[PDB]
Every structure is written in structure tokens, then in C-alpha cells.
Nucleic acid binder design. Structure first.
Length: 436
DNA sequence: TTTTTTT
């Protein structure tokens, strides 16, 4: 039950021995219906992975980290302390040895070291060190147009620059050894539901600032954040925190504070949520960790239902289920540079223990990537600052009428990294071979 | 600056 476009991609991927494929498109329904058909074709022979918990959920798969048991830190190139193959008699080894196809959804969000670690882990475990991905056929799916992968400052950023030249999946060295066949999906739900919105988005993908004129005329409405059912997006945390604080204080009900515990060196600017987190019953929240039991994910929206000492209950918007949340621990890692070898080494220097909850009447655009929302209002504040940030903000909703802006978007806020545009122009051909 | 993934 695929469209003509989807069937062409389906056949191009399944009826060839070629082992490396990229199916790209502004992908929601349509990518997803194709993914499920690929999963049905392959059923036993394919493992589906994704870089984030919410993408893994939508892909009916698991996170890359949870499948390969990678640590939550920089994965140094083919490094035996970071990339460890499974034991001699483990179920993971059996699954990797018997794997025929790896489906990787939302590939645009996969940082280069993660893709390279998948390559090495598959090669080592399968004892096929001369073949990309150990001979596994890889099907990459997703839009090439996203926020850039997270790259912390300091020696980690320098390592990524020195080793790969940048953080994007197409900067992995594995592509120097295998050609990536490219299959485009052009159709989209938005082209049927809001042709104008889709046309504007296409021009903004192409970096045309003139499309901002029509977007601003259609969507600038400063009071749009005061309307019911409207999630507010901000570029920066300070303004989202202020909005969330105002809503929390107006909400009737008794507050309860959750106090984080910090050990060692952990600067407040790195805290993954508030150290003094005040909640009320009915508060709109977002969960900040993936449940190992798969009942909730980082990015799940919900409402507070129960508030108790070191434990709360959240009613999820996604499925209406109740989940019980308790504190999690995040680690602060610093890399020290050796200065006689290349040799940077990670060191955990602090920990932060807190319930994995953040208020969510307002979210950053960065936090909202990967969420599909009903109605959004972009409070621009001091302005958009990152590659793809405007595009991600606009595409959280289905129709242009579901969006409003606090002020006109300026041309300085339409940002695409040039090295990403270069890659895009090169995958127009239908096959791509990385140099060197 | 600026924000965010991953256990």
C-alpha cells in the first residue's frame, strides 16, 4: 500500500545487492509508511535503530546506544574503551552476527562518531573488518535538514574537527569505502493539506529569504501565545523558563519542590533541568530520560498527576498512561588533552541527581525538535541563532495557520551551514561517493 | 555565544 514514489524507493532498496542506501525526504507519514513496509519485508533479518528515544519509538526500534551498549559520551574512532563488542555467548552477539539489514531512522540527527561506532562495532563483532558495517546492508532514512548534532565545547569539539572535519553523518570515513545510493521522497502530507506552507518551506530549505515575506505576513501575530492549546517555543532557555514560571504561579494548587543533589564539579549552566524544580498537580511537563522499560521517552509531554517525596506520577499526552518518575543521575565529563599523544581521555568529574522533569508550557526550539505539535507560537526574543533552527521551529505544526510569530523573522535568522548545503547539492545525483 | 541527543 505505497505510493508510486514510495514503491520506487522500496524496490530500489530491496531488489539490489547494493549495501548502502539513503532515503531522504521532509519525513513524517510517508517516511514512516515506507519504513514499516521495509520492516515487513525484512522481518527477522533487520534491526531498526534511531539516534533518539522518541525517534526510536516512532520507528518501532531502539536507540543506537541501547542496542550496541555504547556509553553516553564521545565515541573515539575505533577506540576499544568506547566501542566494545559483545561477549562470546551473548544474545547481542547473536543478533549482530545474524543481522542482514540495519535500518537507521532520522539519520540527519546521527552524529558522525555514532555512525562510525556502528560501523566498527559491526565489523569487529562479525569479524569482517574489510567491509563497511561488516557486510550489513544499511538503510538510512530521514531529512537531511535538522539541527546540527550536539557538540560540546572544549577538547571534544576539537577531536571531532580533527578526526572527521565536522559532526555530520556524511563526514564519516566509512563512506570513503562504500557508495551511498540516494532515493528522494518529494511528496508530503503538507503538500496536500497546506500547499502554500509546503511551497514556502521548500524555498526556505533553499535559503531564499524572500519567502520570509509571505511567512511574516501570514503568521506574525503577537497575541498568538495567549490562545488556548498553544505551546510556546523560544530560542533560549531563560525566556522559556520565565514563561513556565508565570504559568506555574498562576496555576491553582499546592507546590512541591524537588531539590537536585550535586556531587563533585557540575556547573549550574550544565544542569539538564532545574536544581530547584517546583511542580504542581496539573503542571505541563516534559520528561527528560528514556525509560529502560520503554514506558516513556526523553521528550514525552504530560501532566503532573501525583507529587510525593522523590517520586511523582505523570499522565502522558502521547498515550494517556500514567508513569511513575523517580530521580535520575547525569554525569559531567571533562576531556583532558595529553599534549604528547593525540590521546584525549574522558573523566567523570561530577554528578547531578534530579527527577527527569522540566516544565513545558514553553520549550526551546532545540527541545521541540522531533515533536509534532498542534498549535505553536514562536516567541523570538533575542532571535534565532542556529543552523536549521527556523526550519525546525516552523515544521513542528501541520499548517501555516497553526503557527504564529511574536515578530517578523529577519533574514539573519534563516541559517544553513555551507558544508551541509554542499552535501545536499551532491546527493542530487542519485548516488554519492565520499572523497579520500 | 547557544542549544540539544545519548545511559
Amino acid at each position: 500500500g505505497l505510493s508510486s514514489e514510495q514503491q520506487r524507493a522500496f524496490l530500489a532498496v530491496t531488489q539490489t545487492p547494493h549495501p548502502a542506501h539513503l532515503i531522504t525526504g521532509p519525513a513524517g507519514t510517508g517516511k514512516t509508511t515506507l519504513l514499516y513496509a521495509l520492516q515487513e519485508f525484512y522481518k527477522g533479518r533487520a534491526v531498526t535503530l534511531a539516534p533518539t528515544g522518541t525517534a526510536a519509538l516512532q520507528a518501532r526500534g531502539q536507540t543506537v546506544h541501547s542496542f550496541f551498549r555504547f556509553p553516553a559520551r564521545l565515541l573515539r574512532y575505533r577506540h576499544p574503551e568506547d566501542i566494545r563488542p559483545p561477549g562470546p555467548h551473548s544474545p547481542l552477539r547473536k543478533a549482530i552476527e545474524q543481522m542482514e539489514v540495519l535500518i537507521l531512522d532520522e539519520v540527519g540527527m546521527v552524529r558522525v562518531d555514532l555512525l562510525e561506532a556502528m560501523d566498527w562495532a559491526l565489523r569487529k563483532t562479525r569479524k569482517r573488518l574489510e567491509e563497511p558495517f561488516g557486510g550489513v546492508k544499511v538503510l538510512l532514512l530521514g531529512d537531511t535538514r535538522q539541527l546540527e548534532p550536539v557538540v560540546p565545547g572544549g577538547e571534544e569539539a576539537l577531536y571531532i574537527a580533527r578526526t572527521w572535519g565536522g559532526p555530520f553523518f556524511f563526514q564519516a570515513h566509512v563512506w570513503e569505502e562504500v557508495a551511498l545510493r540516494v532515493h528522494r521522497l518529494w511528496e508530503s502530507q503538507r503538500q496536500r493539506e497546506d500547499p502554500l506552507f509546503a511551497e514556502l518551506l521548500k524555498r526556505l530549505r533553499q535559503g531564499d529569504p524572500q519567502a520570509l515575506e509571505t511567512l511574516n505576513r501570514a503568521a506574525v501575530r503577537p497575541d498568538g501565545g495567549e490562545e488556548p492549546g498553544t505551546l510556546i517555543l523560544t530560542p533560549r532557555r531563560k525566556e522559556a523558563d520565565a514563561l513556565n514560571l508565570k504559568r506555574l504561579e498562576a496555576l491553582p494548587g499546592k507546590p512541591l519542590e524537588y531539590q537536585a543533589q550535586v556531587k563533585g564539579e557540575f556547573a549550574e549552566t550544565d544542569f539538564p533541568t532545574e536544581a530547584a524544580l517546583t511542580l504542581k498537580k496539573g503542571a505541563q511537563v516534559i520528561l527528560l530520560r528514556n525509560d529502560p522499560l520503554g514506558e516513556y521517552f526523553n521528550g514525552d509531554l504530560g501532566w503532573v498527576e501525583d507529587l510525593e517525596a522523590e517520586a511523582l506520577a505523570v499522565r502522558l499526552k502521547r498515550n494517556g498512561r500514567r508513569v511513575v518518575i523517580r530521580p535520575f543521575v547525569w554525569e559531567k565529563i571533562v576531556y583532558t588533552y595529553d599534549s604528547e599523544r593525540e590521546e584525549i581521555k574522558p573523566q567523570v568529574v561530577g554528578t547531578f541527581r534530579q527527577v527527569p522533569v522540566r516544565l513545558a508550557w514553553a520549550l526551546t526550539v532545540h527541545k521541540a525538535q522531533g515533536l509534532t505539535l498542534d498549535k505553536v507560537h514562536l516567541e523570538l526574543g533575542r532571535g534565532l541563532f542556529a543552523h536549521g533552527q527556523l526550519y525546525v521551529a516552523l515544521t513542528r505544526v501541520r499548517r501555516l495557520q497553526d503557527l504564529s510569530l511574536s515578530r517578523p523573522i529577519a533574514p539573519t535568522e534563516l541559517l544553513w551551514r555551507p558544508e551541509v548545503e554542499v552535501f545536499e547539492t551532491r546527493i542530487q545525483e542519485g548516488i554519492w561517493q565520499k572523497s579520500h
